Structure 1
Amino acid sequence: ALPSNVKLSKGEVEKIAVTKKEMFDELAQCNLPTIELITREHTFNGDVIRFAAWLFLMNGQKLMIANNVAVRMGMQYATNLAGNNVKITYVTSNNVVKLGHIAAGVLANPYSNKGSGLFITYEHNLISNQIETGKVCVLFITSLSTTASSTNSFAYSACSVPIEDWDFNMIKLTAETSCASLTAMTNLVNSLVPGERTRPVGLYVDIPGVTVTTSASSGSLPLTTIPAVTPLIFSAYTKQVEEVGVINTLYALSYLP
């Protein structure tokens, strides 16, 4: 801890750094070489840090409508829209597990209020209300005006990803990385009185083949509920667009690189 700056022994480094051994130890039980299975499972396979961040974002958080859903990899059950645990179906393409889904179940109260949401489904286009075989449907909806505004103005970006190409890591919500959605949303925001302007954010997806579409402005939430029969992957919505950030963060945290 004391010396200026020269090559460290293993013992010195174990003293200066946070070790993986120490991280394992947070969860280790009864002097066993492995973390308990039922813990590993819901814990991103040991990652207590990721799990910590993720956990509160997933639950409660005050302005988020009645139960987020994120079906994670390597698990048996996930909680649906009503907060209940249901069986996961995992989906294969080319011998690889791409994703899981569950029955949406019953959203007690509609989305509302001038917020932002990211929803992801298997084969069920929420906008068009139609099935798209072998695609994953990504939907981002948001207020364009601020919570304090007196203008009702909303929009959405959307795209469909062939299941073979699907990769959780290549999706994000952004206000800085250039792409069709950010550009469109930026133009859409600028239609409002300056005082009522949001910080534009877009649906960025970097998977070749896929183009992301952005709607026109709406003055009414593009999506209010989700049919309970819906094969659902991920669903999260704040009542306050000012916090759209946390929704990107949740999603980023839900799935491994």
Structure 2
Amino acid sequence: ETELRALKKLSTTTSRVVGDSTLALPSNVKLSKGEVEKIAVTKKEMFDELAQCNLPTIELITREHTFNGDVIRFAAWLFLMNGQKLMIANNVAVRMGMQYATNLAGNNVKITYVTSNNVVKLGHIAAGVLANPYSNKGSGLFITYEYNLISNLIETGKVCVLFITSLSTTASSTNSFAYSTCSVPIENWDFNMIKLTAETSCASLTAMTNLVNSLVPGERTRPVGLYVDIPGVTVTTSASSGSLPLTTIPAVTPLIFSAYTKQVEEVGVINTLYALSYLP
């Protein structure tokens, strides 16, 4: 029975040591920790990027604006946040767990964190003075607090999100524009549930499908529709206006998320920025 004791240890560990052979080990065989350290990218290694002074944790001031050290999302989110050629002025994204966030003009603003049932839900900042109005035919996503941009009316305790778009192709000189809007209660608010989709079926997407079909086949562009998964929200579109719905946003108006692309073809870039901005 003592043979069982020794032969049992063969299960616990491997006689093999780490090395180049670990790369060439056949796929069917099992692995030890040392080899798995080599083969797969370790969570330590990503944590090792910002590690200084061999501290147990990375610097607090760094963890604030790096999504608590999630470097992978931080890199891609950073460029789309600002520096894109086609984005007008500076896209405004209020990331959670932050002291300051830039506004449309570019001044960093102390963020008013809204607390829901003793839990911080989201924060907003003053819009500031927009550099320029949104000129060309492009799409954009807008999220504001206690305000409706189309109606210019304030609803206390309610968050309204607007999506604007240009149906016509940028090359096509014909001008057709529409938008989708909805108001969400403060309580059941989750950034994850909202997205811009071209495949998932929703009421906004249905409107865009036939609305583009209204235009000539040469100038058609694939529909991009607002989708909201949260209970208690109704998405309302608009008829084909043919003129841009929103040109500028007042500074006094509270702001949560706002991003517009000069051309419509890079509409999906907006959704990517929204996806990266808030962790689910």
TM-score range, shorter chain: over 0.9
Task: Give per-residue Cα distances to partners, 1:10-35, cap 9 Å, x unaligned.
Answer: 11111110110000000111110111
Task: Please give the root-mean-square deviation of Cα atoms over the aligned residues, in Å.
Answer: 0.8
Structure richer in strand, relative to its length: 1
Q: CA deviation at 1:61?
A: 0.9
Task: Give per-residue Cα distances to partners, 1:180-222, cap 9 Å, x unaligned.
Answer: 0000011111111111111101000011111100011111111
* Structure 2 counterpart SS, 1:176: coil
Q: CA deviation at 1:4?
A: 3.3
The equivalent of 1:100 in structure 2 is 123
Q: Write the distance in 2 (CA, Å) between the matches of 1:170 and 1:214.
A: 18
1:1-257 equivalences in 2 (<5 Å): 1-257=24-280
For structure 2, the 5+ residue unaligned runs are 1-23
Q: CA deviation at 1:93?
A: 1.4
Please identify, of 86-95 and 138-147, the stretch whose mean Cα deviation from structure 2 is larger: 86-95
* Structure 2 counterpart SS, 1:12: helix
Q: Write the distance in 1 (CA, Å) between the matches of 2:83 and 2:209.
A: 30
TM-score, normalization: structure 1? 0.98
Please identify, of 121-130 and 88-97, the stretch whose mean Cα deviation from structure 2 is larger: 88-97
Task: Give per-residue Cα distances to partners, 1:42-72, cap 9 Å, x unaligned.
Answer: 1000000100010001011111100000000
* Structure 2 counterpart SS, 1:132: coil
For structure 1, the 5+ residue unaligned runs are none
* Structure 2 counterpart SS, 1:30: coil
* Structure 2 counterpart SS, 1:18: coil
Task: Give per-residue Cα distances to partners, 1:97-148, cap 9 Å, x unaligned.
Answer: 1111000001110012010110101011001000011111100000000000
Distance 1:4 1:208, change over 3 A: closer
Q: CA deviation at 1:89?
A: 0.6
How many residue pairs were aligned?
Answer: 257
Q: Write the distance in 2 (CA, Å) between the matches of 1:212 and 1:92.
A: 26
Which structure: larger Rg?
A: 2
Q: Write the distance in 1 (CA, Å) between the matches of 2:59 and 2:252.
A: 34
* Structure 2 counterpart SS, 1:46: coil
Q: Write the distance in 1 (CA, Å) between the matches of 2:245 and 2:25.
A: 60
Q: Write the distance in 1 (CA, Å) between the matches of 2:33 and 2:248.
A: 55
Q: CA deviation at 1:3?
A: 3.1
* Structure 2 counterpart SS, 1:137: strand
- Give percent identity, aligned residues only: 98
Q: CA deviation at 1:169?
A: 0.5
* Structure 2 counterpart SS, 1:203: strand
Q: Write the distance in 2 (CA, Å) between the matches of 1:252 and 1:96.
A: 22
* Structure 2 counterpart SS, 1:50: helix
Q: CA deviation at 1:2?
A: 2.8
Task: Give per-residue Cα distances to partners, 1:127-176, cap 9 Å, x unaligned.
Answer: 10000111111000000000001211000001000000111000000100
* Structure 2 counterpart SS, 1:7: coil
Q: Write the distance in 1 (CA, Å) between the matches of 2:92 and 2:173.
A: 31
Q: CA deviation at 1:236?
A: 0.3
